[PDB]
Design a protein around this ligand. Structure first.
Ligand SMILES: N[C@@H](Cc1c[nH]c[nH+]1)C(=O)O
Length: 238
């Protein structure tokens, strides 16, 4: 009943969770989690690269069978799809040039150019709260474009998952002159409760299989071993 091949869509521009190494192989914590779960589910899995905003449509169209792409578990998303249990926690946070006075507030951001990933919870938040009120919110096909436009000085700030910005950019050579601008942006309704495997609502069996795999690799400590490759903190949360 489970497919012998589970097709998993991911947006490979979100290090350290999902990206590509120099020879084009998919790498990162999402990939590690996905591969470990598939192993324990005893299914073959095929990774499929996609822009983030195409993931849920591809899933609904059955071009893929699952999404592992730091996809936040939100009220809004669950109207369209189902989710596995939580894979890890994910807060949102602004980044900007080091020394910048920028804060995640309308007062600070009005007339500023702020980059967000198209289709993301950050785009939802920024469009509702900031774009309406005169912040130049700029939506991008992928997160790599955002970092590029930031370093080029075309953007004043960018909003994205906190850990991705930190491990994927700030702690990298390209992000040396950048820092977080203000604390995490906390908003329960927009940003959801951690990330999970996104699935078609009727695929209850595939969800059960992922959930079971996830519980097992967390219990035996495999989760923590894989996570320590990327993180010196508790990425899972509570
Ligand atoms: N986790 C957020 C932001 C994100 C973009 N890509 C991966 N994560 C979301 O689900 O929209």
């Amino acid at each position: 009943a489970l497919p012998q091949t589970v097709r998993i869509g991911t947006d490979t521009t979100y290090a350290p969770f999902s990206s590509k190494d120099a020879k084009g192989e998919f790498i990162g914590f999402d990939i590690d989690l996905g591969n470990e779960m598939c192993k324990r589910m005893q299914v073959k899995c095929t990774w499929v690269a996609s822009d983030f905003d195409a993931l849920i449509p591809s899933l609904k169209a059955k071009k893929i069978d699952a999404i592992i792409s730091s996809l936040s578990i939100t009220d809004k998303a669950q109207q369209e799809i189902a989710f596995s249990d939580k894979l890890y926690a994910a807060d949102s946070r602004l980044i900007a040039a080091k020394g910048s006075p920028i804060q995640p507030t309308l007062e600070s951001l009005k007339g500023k150019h702020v980059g967000v990933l198209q289709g993301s919870t950050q785009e939802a938040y920024a469009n509702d709260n900031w774009r309406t009120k005169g912040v130049d919110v700029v939506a991008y096909a992928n997160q790599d474009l955002i970092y590029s436009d930031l370093t080029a000085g075309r953007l004043d700030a960018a909003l994205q998952d906190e850990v991705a910005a930190s491990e994927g950019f700030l702690k990298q050579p390209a992000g040396k002159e950048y820092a977080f601008a203000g604390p995490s942006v906390k908003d329960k309704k927009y940003f959801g409760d951690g990330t999970g495997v996104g699935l078609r609502k009727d695929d209850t069996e595939l969800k059960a299989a992922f959930d079971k795999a996830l519980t097992e690799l967390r219990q035996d400590g495999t989760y923590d071993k894989m996570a320590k490759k990327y993180f010196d903190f508790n990425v899972y949360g509570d």
